[PDB]
Nucleic acid binder design. Structure first.
Ligand code: MG
Ligand code: MG
Ligand code: MG
Ligand code: MG
Ligand code: MG
Ligand code: MG
Ligand code: MG
Ligand code: MG
Ligand code: MG
Ligand code: MG
Ligand code: MG
Ligand code: MG
Ligand code: MG
Ligand code: MG
Ligand code: MG
Ligand code: MG
Ligand code: MG
Ligand code: MG
Ligand code: MG
Ligand code: MG
Ligand code: MG
Ligand code: MG
Ligand code: MG
Ligand code: MG
Ligand code: MG
Ligand code: MG
Lengths: 380, 132, 62
RNA sequence: UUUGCCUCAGGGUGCUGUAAACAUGAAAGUAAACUUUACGAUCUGUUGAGGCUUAUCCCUAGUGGUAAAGUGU
RNA sequence: CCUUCGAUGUCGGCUCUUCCUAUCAUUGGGACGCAGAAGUCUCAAAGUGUCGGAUUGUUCACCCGCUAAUAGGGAACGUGAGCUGGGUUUAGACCGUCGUGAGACAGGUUAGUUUUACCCUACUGAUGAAUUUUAUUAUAUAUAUACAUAUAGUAUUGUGACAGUAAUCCAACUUGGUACGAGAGGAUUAGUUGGUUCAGACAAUUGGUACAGCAAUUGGUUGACAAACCAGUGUUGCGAAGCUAAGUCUGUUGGAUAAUGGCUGAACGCCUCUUAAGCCAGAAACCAUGCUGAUUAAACAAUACUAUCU
RNA sequence: GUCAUCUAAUUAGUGACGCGCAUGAAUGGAUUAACGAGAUUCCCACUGUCCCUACUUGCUAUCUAGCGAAACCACAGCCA
RNA sequence: AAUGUUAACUCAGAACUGAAACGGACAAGGGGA
RNA sequence: AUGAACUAGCCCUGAAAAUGGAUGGCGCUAAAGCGGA
RNA sequence: UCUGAUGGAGGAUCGAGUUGAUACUGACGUGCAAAUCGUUCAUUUCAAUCACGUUUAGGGGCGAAAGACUAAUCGAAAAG
């Protein structure tokens, strides 16, 4: 018989296999379509989630009951130590998908980067890359030429500098970053210019840019059906237990169906959240980084007592509107949007009035320790 | 006459009994339905500050009892996020009886009223003392 | 920065922080924190709490 | 897995709410000396004190540590 | 009365999924006794949705109210090793009628044990070897070469076949008291700001949570003070962090079509959307894009290093 | 069943009505204070019963060392 | 009649006192129509 | 050499049900269809 | 005939224990258990409870009646 009262299904079937992601470093599934009219630019960037603060922002939306008024908004902070470019990879389009021609490496590859090619650095003789680094430039040139000739898509092998962050791990995070621009030649030139050097975020993103944020979600291990899918608790009266699904399925398809919610992994899923606005791009060389026209007080972005479970952001950082998947310390990949958005949301220019820097470890009263000291006075 | 209303924390579900707030002669209001509420399997319809309810008067003038009657919520105790970042709450849940159009059946409004409600119902602003 | 004041304590409430309780009358009380709000609810009198500024002033502890 | 890491400690950040100790300090009063001496919830001073603060907080080249030596190809 | 009487657990609700379309709403149309608005009939459509209660064991029913709409169905009259057990269908008991009576009632009323998964599969997640009659969309200095390449082991980065798929509806306002209309009334469409439902995260903030912790305190116990303890977490207060919703954030645009309207244009010297050939625009559908997985491909590529290799 | 009343709505409840399929007088009729782990309805208080779930504690589960059953079982074990 | 030695435990009243709390744990009717 | 009326072949409509789906399958249209020889 | 004491009646009231077994139709249901566990509940000066002794025996007993009980056996025990 038909179900008496109709309701929408509980999970999204669009996010199935609710299994653990293969790696902490969210992979970019796809990069923006190529618009060969525009200059060559990177499309992506890796950063580490540091925490959230709140912000105060004056609004522009003519017609809203929230028009001229200051508003408070949550924002993530993503520490964004300059990514370093190490390689170029050339793809060519086939009826079987993208196939790599080659990868061309820098002459000098960081120790950090090398650490990725080992699971026991401490023991190893660290021979990785020691012969490639040597190679003659002629070969490289030839490779480049080949790429120019045949490859339709260029990616840059970039890696993070986690040494310049409070994170424990000396291993780099290595990531391919598609380059989108005019002529393949032009792209190649751009990558050559870049190669061994550093990309800071300002070279990739701008204020008020709408960005997609791709990251592995916070883990919760094996979770019940109730938590994992938002299935209804059965009543108190229930014998075998309340927190389950009463009927898996009908009798006749005599097989539990993949559409029925079940106990199992929740979190540590890969996820692309879209349309996250950059409210601010911080700079390492700015003591007035969390300061504003309305503030006018020396503030670094780090809250008092430091980002809980992270540490102290001492480098360029992104202030993204709202929330981002995963935990404090998680790698996040920021990606340019795959469509050039013209919606008033994407065009709006933000002007922060205030950025909270009160302790996140408690209900903080003060912005700076100095203020606190002033408040209290001299004491024991 | 804008019904633009920024979302406010939902909690005053069907069955709730709220103070009548008004000069109408009604002492209480038992909320039986929320207007503009849609469909959600086992979810109780639940009203907030701006919302139009349909109520009965449990206690009050007999000419108000035994009838379903439109009301507006003026106060609630569920704290709700004002967009300047602070959460406001009143001590009491309280609304004012009105017509479908939104015209008060009563004349004055006893206690304070939320600004969220003032912005929505001009005739209610009129009869409000402290509007906060 | 327009810092409101904590009513129960005399603390500065920077934007987007505390909560606002509008009593029976129309009088608003702004509390910086959960604790303060709880205290207010309990009808506790700040001038009888050793840590608060109101108490401090009463005992001339500047 | 020695420009790390653990470990304590210090500093930060908070949380709590003012520690023990002493005070010919105060105290509703009482009693028993020839104005002093007992008892006395509690309060006040020294006291935003004391305690706690990563076990899944933060910083510090601040302390002492960093073994096993085995297996697979 | 074919199957099942060496038992297929016999109503309904709760939960949960999927399917159908004989479409209630939403998308796009066609007709009208279509002026507008509202509605009626109807085509492509099953993408999205279809609620809260009162009474009843109910299915069904009937009202109240919201709603865009409160369409109809199936899946062993879905779903009892999922529950529930109100009903029906044991034993107690009561009434009514019937029976001389024991008793009967497809009459009414009350009280009445709901067992087992540790097996195989399925599904959910979780590891994980092996894979040369196997592979390959090219490699190599304009020529060659499948009469050819390919050791293996670690690791990184990719490929992405295939599978899954996600957003939905409304309101208010401006367009407009305009078009339309004798007047009453009164739009479509875009545009803006919001909200619903759903999904996916997240915890700055508010709230929740306590066997981090601090403080209080009852009864007892250590001579007292202190420091503690005990009362299965003694009980309060606050309570960071971590979890978390009732809190915050985010949720596309192409291709090719369907209905349909058209174009050129015969058959049929004219006409004809094609009921020929040839074309066009065109849907919440379809397929991509995007999104999740990809020991779903026993898949594969490149790169890094190596133990012997030719 | 009809009419009230309880409700926004009540196949429930209560009060009436009665040619009562088939009520009725020790098959006892009608009514009754007190009493009831009795049946039923409504109202106040109260609450996680619910909206709408969350967090948390022991003991299990879990992994290890030790110990170690059974029902069941033609053969077995993917679908249209 | 005044002056002695001396005993329970119970009642009643008043000050002060505290983060308004106190049958602080334990124990212990939900009530009405 | 157009206009009628019929007529019966194949085809089309009429032709809507629930797991996904069955001329047995793939597929077939100068048939691998239907009727003959 | 009122008022205050006294007095201490009652198959009176509440209630540990005891005797039971209302609800959770909780746990358990290959149990600790062929009826247990938990919390809640009813019973407590009388038609009360318990022990031992004693009587009543199968178409018989015993029954404040449930076809209850009569050694896990009862609409006719068990043994042969
Ligand atoms: Mg915090
Ligand atoms: Mg329901
Ligand atoms: Mg809190
Ligand atoms: Mg002291
Ligand atoms: Mg640590
Ligand atoms: Mg079966
Ligand atoms: Mg149809
Ligand atoms: Mg229709
Ligand atoms: Mg049927
Ligand atoms: Mg079953
Ligand atoms: Mg069962
Ligand atoms: Mg059933
Ligand atoms: Mg029953
Ligand atoms: Mg019976
Ligand atoms: Mg918290
Ligand atoms: Mg002891
Ligand atoms: Mg609390
Ligand atoms: Mg023709
Ligand atoms: Mg009722
Ligand atoms: Mg009656
Ligand atoms: Mg008779
Ligand atoms: Mg054939
Ligand atoms: Mg019983
Ligand atoms: Mg049971
Ligand atoms: Mg069990
Ligand atoms: Mg027996």
């Amino acid at each position: 018989s038909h179900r008496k009262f109709e309701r929408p299904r509980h999970g999204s079937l669009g996010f199935l296999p609710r299994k653990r992601c293969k790696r902490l470093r969210g992979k970019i599934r796809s990069f923006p379509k190529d618009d060969k009219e525009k200059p060559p630019h990177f499309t992506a960037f890796m950063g580490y989630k540091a925490g959230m603060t709140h912000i105060v922002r004056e609004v522009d939306k003519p017609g809203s009951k929230l028009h001229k008024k200051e508003i408070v908004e949550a924002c993530t902070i993503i520490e964004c130590a300059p990514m370093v470019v190490v390689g170029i990879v050339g793809y060519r389009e086939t009826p079987k998908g993208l196939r790599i021609l080659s990868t061309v490496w820098a002459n000098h590859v960081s120790d950090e980067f090398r650490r990725r090619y080992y699971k026991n650095w401490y023991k190893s003789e660290k021979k990785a890359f020691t012969k490639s680094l040597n190679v003659p430039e002629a070969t490289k040139n030839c490779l480049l030429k080949r790429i120019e000739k045949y490859c339709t898509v260029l990616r840059a092998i970039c890696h993070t500098q986690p040494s310049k962050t409070p994170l424990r791990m000396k291993k780099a995070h290595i990531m391919e970053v598609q380059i989108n621009g005019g002529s393949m030649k032009e792209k190649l030139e751009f990558v050559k210019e870049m190669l061994e050097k550093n990309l800071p975020v300002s070279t990739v993103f701008n204020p008020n840019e709408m960005i997609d944020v791709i990251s592995v979600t916070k883990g919760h291990g094996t979770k019940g059906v109730v938590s994992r899918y938002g299935v209804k608790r059965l009543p108190r009266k229930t014998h075998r237990g309340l927190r389950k699904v009463a009927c898996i399925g009908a009798w006749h398809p005599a097989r539990v169906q993949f559409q029925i919610p079940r106990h199992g992994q929740k979190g540590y899923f890969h996820r692309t959240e879209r349309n996250k606005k950059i409210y601010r791009i911080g700079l390492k060389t700015d003591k007035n980084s969390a300061s504003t026209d309305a503030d006018i007080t020396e503030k670094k972005i780090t809250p008092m007592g430091g980002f809980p479970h992270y540490g102290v952001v001492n480098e360029d950082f992104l202030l993204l509107k709202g929330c981002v998947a995963g935990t404090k310390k998680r790698p996040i990949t920021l990606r340019k949007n795959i469509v050039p958005q013209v919606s008033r949301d994407a065009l709006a220019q933000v002007s922060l009035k205030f950025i909270d820097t009160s302790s996140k470890i408690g209900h903080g009263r003060f912005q700076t320790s100095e203020e606190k000291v002033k408040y209290y006075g001299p004491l024991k | 006459t804008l019904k633009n209303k920024m979302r406010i924390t939902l909690s005053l579900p069907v069955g709730a009994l709220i103070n009548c707030c008004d000069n109408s002669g009604g002492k209480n209001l038992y909320i039986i339905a929320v207007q503009g509420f849609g469909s959600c399997l086992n979810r109780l319809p639940a009203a907030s500050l701006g919302d139009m309810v349909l109520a009965t008067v449990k206690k009050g003038k007999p000419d108000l009892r035994k009838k379903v009657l439109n009301a507006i919520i003026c106060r609630q105790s569920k704290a709700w996020r004002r967009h300047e970042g602070y959460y406001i709450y009143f001590e009491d849940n309280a609304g004012v009886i009105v017509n479908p159009k939104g015209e008060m059946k009563g004349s004055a409004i006893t206690g304070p009223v939320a600004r969220e409600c003032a912005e929505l119902w001009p005739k209610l602003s009129s009869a409000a003392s402290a509007i906060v | 920065v327009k810092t409101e004041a904590c009513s129960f304590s005399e603390y500065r409430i920077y934007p987007g922080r505390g909560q606002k309780y509008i009593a029976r009358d129309g009088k608003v009380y702004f509390y910086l924190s959960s604790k303060f709000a709880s205290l207010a609810l309990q009808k506790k009198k700040a001038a009888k709490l050793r840590w608060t500024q109101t108490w401090r002033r009463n005992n001339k502890k500047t």
